[PDB]
Amino acid sequence: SKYEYTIXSYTFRGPGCPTLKPXITVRCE
Numbered sequence: 001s002k003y004e005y006t007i008x009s010y011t012f013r014g015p016g017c018p019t020l021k022p023x024i025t026v027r028c029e
Contacts, residue, residue: 001029 003017005026017028 003028 001017002013002015003026004011004013005020005024007024020026
């Protein structure tokens with residue numbers, strides 16, 4: 001299970017799914 005969480009276009013990929021601000025393409029698992 002990984003969140004693919006680009007802030008704008010800045011990707012960070014790890015072992016988590018937190019809730020985040022509107023307009024992030026945070027795609028859990």
